[PDB]
Design a protein around this ligand. Structure first.
Ligand SMILES: CCCCCCCC/C=C/CCCCCCCC(=O)OC[C@H](COP(=O)(O)OCCN)OC(=O)CCCCCCC/C=C/CCCCCCCC
Ligand SMILES: CCCCCCCC/C=C\CCCCCCCC(=O)OC[C@H](COP(=O)(O)OCCN)OC(=O)CCCCCCC/C=C\CCCCCCCC
Ligand SMILES: CCCCCCCC/C=C\CCCCCCCC(=O)OC[C@H](COP(=O)(O)OCCN)OC(=O)CCCCCCC/C=C\CCCCCCCC
Lengths: 717, 26, 716
């Protein structure tokens, strides 16, 4: 059937020689059953157990019946004819059957037959596969054909692991060859030795004088010359078979069939990653080479990881269809269309076919190359790189140089950051999260951000022991410096004086334990965040009047236990985020600042709220969540601009009815308080709804069912 | 039972997750 | 099975003759096995061991038993009958088996069997390929085109595989030689020994001690039959000789290792089909002997012209006119654009559509534009990006009267077209790509002198220095924009020759100083210095000599303050100074009241100053992202403002007179601190909900009649 590829020319030659030899055996056998006899004539005169051999001629009268002649023929044929002449065809048939069994033992032995059928099946189906031609030619591929290609790659890999462990097929072929050649030697020796005993004239002396009358007879064996030429033809065929067998043995022993070098195929194609296959796999590949090198050449393309990498990229382009990407599209906090690619083999080209996409998110993408099809991604402005080692094509590099404007790089190794990010010129927002500080790579890798010109936002969650000199060089144009060391103190050394264009500074989780003077030397800052800097004392803020433009002093998540009165000098503050601090009393001087809008003092130690809060008319969201405030003063409701009164988790005994005067209130939080009952005037706020009015259900039930109907309608309408 | 065993074993033999679990083990 | 194509008439004839010879061989073998015997009767009277050949007649009493007769028959059959008469059918069987082995060793030897099977498969696949019909005709499905391309690649690979060496031809020649010499030997010995098959044989075996007679006369009954089985067989061999001899002549009258497609390449249009050689040539000659149509329709897969035709036909089926109208868009110039990106070839239907005006070719390799681009009517733009364009002379001449604008995106010299210099009638041109290479400092753009009707040239080529070739070229120029994307531009007062320039754009030239050559051109109405990182503009005092600048563009810079002297430029009509560092804009600066357009967003203005009241001939002010709290009477003495860009501000309130501004196209309020929209804004039904940009919570404070009127005017 399909095993012809595994039978080289020597195997075919021995197969046909065995067929012809079996024909000889059958012919000799049927002649031996049919017309094998010995016409025996007695010797009338004998001399010492031998024929004496001593007017017209007359025939000799033996006085023997026909049946006495037949008896003499049978007796002399059994006794005095040589065994070779009698059993030549059966010996030939036995020898040919053993030869055929030896030539076909590895096809029938299950341990080798399983490997052989696996090799033949996967090799043939690899040979007729279309992706072999596609790869050797070096587009779009059908779904069924792609599934066949990936299944065939996995099957080839698993078969390569299954076969290379042992050398059972090589050992069995070897043993069959030695058995065949030694049997050829024995056959030729004994057949040549005994071939001369097939004689036409046979002298028999069988001692049947009591039944016939004569003792010695001279028999003629008619099928003696025909058996002689048949035996000579059989000897010639066995000689040819044996010569082929020694050629096969020499071919097996001259080289090492347990080691294949693919240097011919691998150098011819672009795939230099094809391994040198060994053992049994190498043996049947050598057999296939004896049949046809093209099968091995087309099979070697399935043993290279480059080919399977290309196949995976093409398949990923195929499976990730356009419509499923459309339904995969989302929106970010900046209201831009978004696409998060998480844990893929590569990046789909149908992702790059999109046109409405704005932010693509490359997370955990191992060693992909950006195709130039990014020319379709015109709305693309934010490339998000998470642990993605990206290689870049030159036209796509130019396109990203002229289009891409925001790049976020997270990496675990300092070699993971792409080196083409410095060539970007339209980039303004950079988020280098991950340790830039390493031995001899401490800010020397990012020394190429001097090539960056328009960079304004530089987020650094990178555990920086000291701030780089490269940002001192760059910060003339930098407008935001978010540094997260996650527990490492900055030695700032007043190096921000050359960095004059910052409008925002977010020193988060830096463990500074004190406000440095670099923020004080600056003048253009308007949003200052010092989150989780372990700020025990904030007494320096008296000098913050020098910063005439600050509007958001986010002194939250620190160890601040009190507020100095000089914060009253800071009239320009609009949002003062002091939540999650240890402040226990608000000085009234803090309450001088009329411009405060977001007074978040949540999760603190405040026990009372001063009445001067009524002066803060611009306050909108007063969040005193999880405090010790027992009673809200009525002056709190003097400020009519309260939009979100976060009073949750406090110890508010009762909420006064003056909240009915407030109109801007949209969401009030009272769940988790000591609130006895909800007053009716809480329903007087127009914009308040059930989603805004978060409260315990029994507390909601205290409102009148008509007022409860109004609020439930605000939930509905 | 012989047909069920050979069907289950053959379909297991062409299962990708067998190779996945072999990689996870080794 | 499918090997019948490789068997010519001589091979079929020899196969049939071998079958007939095998039939007579097994017939004679059955006769020889079963009834071959010899009836031997003793000669009663003899003379010197010879048969002397010397009242009703009576039979001769030989006094011999039946078994003595059988022994005499066996001995005189073995000893005296000729070996030819006894083993003729076995010799015929052996010769027939040798002939069959010689004939079928072609198909049984694996090395040539593999090549024969590959050739049969490839030839039958090409025979059944539908594209061949089209290839012999001069639409196809996606499957048809894909399989045609795959089988084209398979044919190329097979040609590379088989043409390298001749093993099939050598084996066929050796088989023919062996068959010829076997026929010669067979005829010789059979003709020599056919006269020994005689009916009558005189045998003298010397068995007198066992029989009593010396010489016997024997009749061989099958001999005559063997005679009519021998001479007949000889005749068959003669035929098998002559036919084989003809085959040998067919292998020697011409070199079969050189197949010529001259007849096909002359009859068909494809003249590029190579003269194939070696084993490919031999099997093609065999197929020609079988049927010339197989080779005729296989010859179209050996030519690259047919490969190009298939590629263009496949891409034509891909991009029909309907899908082209689907991909049709419009650009910023309101011209019909057709974004063709990442195609192996250019389509022909895209040139069939006469509506096309901007032919876009972005990153399309192997571009060769046929004269069907003359079919385009509105073609005035050719946006070739990373495209190596090849254009014939008639299509080039058509471009010489219709093409007007031409954008090039290139990677140095690699992707720069060469036919653009002969174009002398275009009017616009764009360039992009680094030019200041080592030893090639602006030397690749030296061929743009023949272009006389050129009027617009825009460059973005990160120039480290100003090219002298640009200064020489720009004599006939009207609009010129230079983008260096963060590179110094060394003008060095060499723009004094550039007297004809009416718009000078310097985008991201990072100058930090205004070159003194700008003050010499009296045609410039637009001066653009965007993203030049200008901090102190102390060169506008020297701008007083010019009397043509209508709009300065110092935006996206860091200008801390704008000096007083810039208020002496009355001809200025458009100030783009947004995203700057301006703290207080002086009132004296607004002595120029003809400031129609204005951009001052993203700045540090703390209040809108006095002489905005002096402004009267304006249409917009951009006050986005600064520290201005109110719309004062200063903005309220303006009666022609149409767009207010005042968003994300700390603007406390809108006073009343903004409700007289009925001609209010837009307002921008993306985060502003307004208490509420005044009822005076209900005085203007002209401003509609889509017209103005108002926050939803801010918009809802208007009266329900006013809000209903706003939604109505949105519908009305
Ligand atoms: C080891 C495996 C062998 C397989 C054996 C297969 C089955 C064997 C059993 C045979 C079944 C029945 C057949 C028996 C017939 C016996 C008749 C018999 O012996 O009679 C004696 C008498 C003796 O013959 P003579 O004329 O002296 O012949 C001498 C030759 N010069 O014979 C007859 O009267 C007729 C013989 C009958 C012949 C039957 C067998 C013939 C077989 C045909 C051979 C085919 C040849 C193939 C091609 C030959 C080469 C080109
Ligand atoms: C290599 C291995 C060599 C194997 C050959 C063994 C030879 C040993 C010789 C033994 C020997 O000489 O002893 C004699 C003795 C004969 O004795 P007599 O006739 O009394 O003596 C005659 C006087 N010469 O010889 C033998 O026994 C020869 C042995 C012959 C065995 C051959 C096998 C035959 C088996 C028959 C099964 C085949 C059936 C096929 C089925 C057909 C289906 C279509
Ligand atoms: C010139 C070239 C000659 C080509 C022929 C080769 C053999 C020539 C032999 C010359 C010679 O001297 O032969 C004698 C010699 C002895 O003859 P006797 O009968 O003792 O004496 C004859 C009385 N004069 O004769 C021979 O040996 C005959 C040689 C011919 C062999 C016959 C063919 C051999 C192949 C047989 C095929 C077997 C196939 C069986 C399968 C059947 C299908 C199921």
């Amino acid at each position: 059937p399909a095993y012809r590829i595994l039978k080289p020319w020597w195997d075919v030659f021995t197969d046909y020689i065995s067929i012809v030899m079996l024909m000889i055996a059958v012919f000799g056998g049927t002649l031996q059953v049919t017309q094998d006899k010995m016409i025996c004539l007695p010797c009338k005169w004998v001399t010492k157990d031998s024929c004496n051999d001593s007017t017209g001629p007359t025939g000799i009268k033996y006085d023997l019946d026909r049946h006495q002649y037949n008896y003499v023929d049978a007796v002399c044929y059994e006794n005095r004819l040589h065994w070779f002449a009698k059993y030549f065809p059966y010996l030939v048939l036995l020898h040919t059957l053993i030869f055929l069994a030896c030539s076909n033992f590895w096809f029938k032995f299950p341990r080798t037959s399983s490997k052989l059928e696996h090799f033949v099946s996967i090799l043939l189906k690899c040979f007729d596969s279309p992706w072999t031609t596609r790869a050797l030619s070096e587009g779009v591929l059908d779904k069924k054909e792609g599934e066949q290609a990936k299944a065939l790659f996995e099957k080839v890999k698993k078969f390569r692991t299954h076969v290379e462990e042992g050398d059972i097929v090589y050992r069995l072929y070897m043993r069959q060859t030695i058995i065949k050649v030694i049997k050829f030697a024995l056959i030729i020796c004994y057949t040549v030795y005994y071939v001369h005993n097939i004689k036409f004239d046979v002298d028999c002396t069988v001692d049947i004088e009591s039944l016939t009358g004569y003792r010695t007879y001279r028999c003629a064996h008619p099928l003696a010359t025909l058996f002689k030429i048949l035996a000579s033809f059989y000897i010639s065929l066995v000689i040819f078979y044996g010569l082929i067998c020694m050629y096969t043995l020499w071919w097996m022993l001259r080289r090492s069939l347990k080691k294949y070098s693919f240097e011919s195929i691998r150098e011819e194609s672009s795939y230099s990653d094809i391994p040198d296959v060994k053992n049994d796999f190498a043996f049947m590949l050598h057999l296939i080479d004896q049949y046809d090198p093209l099968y091995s050449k087309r099979f070697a393309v399935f043993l290279s990881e480059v080919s399977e990498n290309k196949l995976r990229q093409l398949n990923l382009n195929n499976e990730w269809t356009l419509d499923k990407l459309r339904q995969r599209l989302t929106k970010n906090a900046q209201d831009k269309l978004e696409l998060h690619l998480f844990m893929l083999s590569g990046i789909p080209d149908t992702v790059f076919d999109l046109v409405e996409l704005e932010v693509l998110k490359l997370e955990l993408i191992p060693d992909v190359t950006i195709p130039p099809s990014i020319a379709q991604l015109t709305g693309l402005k934010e490339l998000w790189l998470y642990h993605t080692a990206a290689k870049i094509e030159a036209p796509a590099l130019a396109f990203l140089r002229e289009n891409l404007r925001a790049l976020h790089i997270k990496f675990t190794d300092i070699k993971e950051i792409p080196l083409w990010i410095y060539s970007l010129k339209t980039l303004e927002e950079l988020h280098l999260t991950g340790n830039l500080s390493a031995e001899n790579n401490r800010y020397i890798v990012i020394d190429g951000l001097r090539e960056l010109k328009r960079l304004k936002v530089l987020r650094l969650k990178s555990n920086l022991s000291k701030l780089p000199q490269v940002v001192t060089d760059v910060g003339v144009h930098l407008q935001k410096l978010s540094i997260n060391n996650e527990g490492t103190k900055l030695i700032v050394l007043n190096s921000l004086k050359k960095m004059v264009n910052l409008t925002e500074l977010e020193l988060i989780r830096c463990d500074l334990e004190r406000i440095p003077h670099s923020i004080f030397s600056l003048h253009n800052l308007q949003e200052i965040d010092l989150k989780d800097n372990n700020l025990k004392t904030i007494e320096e803020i008296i000098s913050f009047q020098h910063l005439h433009r600050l509007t958001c002093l986010k002194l939250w998540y620190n160890h601040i236990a009190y507020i100095p009165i000089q914060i009253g000098n800071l009239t320009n503050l609009e949002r003062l985020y002091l939540n999650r601090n240890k402040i226990e009393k608000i000085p009234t001087q803090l309450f001088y600042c009329r411009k405060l809008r977001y007074l978040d003092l949540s999760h603190n130690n405040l026990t009372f709220l001063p009445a001067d809060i009524g002066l803060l008319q611009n306050l909108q969201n007063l969040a005193v969540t999880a405090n010790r405030i027992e009673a809200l003063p009525p002056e709190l409701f003097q400020c009519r601009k309260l939009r979100a009164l976060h009073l949750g988790n406090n110890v508010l005994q009762s909420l006064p009815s003056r909240v009915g005067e407030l109109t801007n209130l949209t969401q009030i939080e009272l769940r988790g308080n000591r609130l006895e009952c909800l007053p009716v005037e809480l329903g007087e706020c127009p914009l308040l709804k059930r989603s805004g009015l978060v409260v315990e259900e029994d507390l909601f039930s205290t409102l009148p069912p008509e007022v409860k109907e109004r609020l439930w309608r605000a939930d509905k309408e | 039972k012989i047909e069920h065993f050979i069907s289950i074993l053959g379909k297991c033999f062409d299962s990708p997750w067998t190779t996945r679990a072999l990689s996870e083990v080794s």
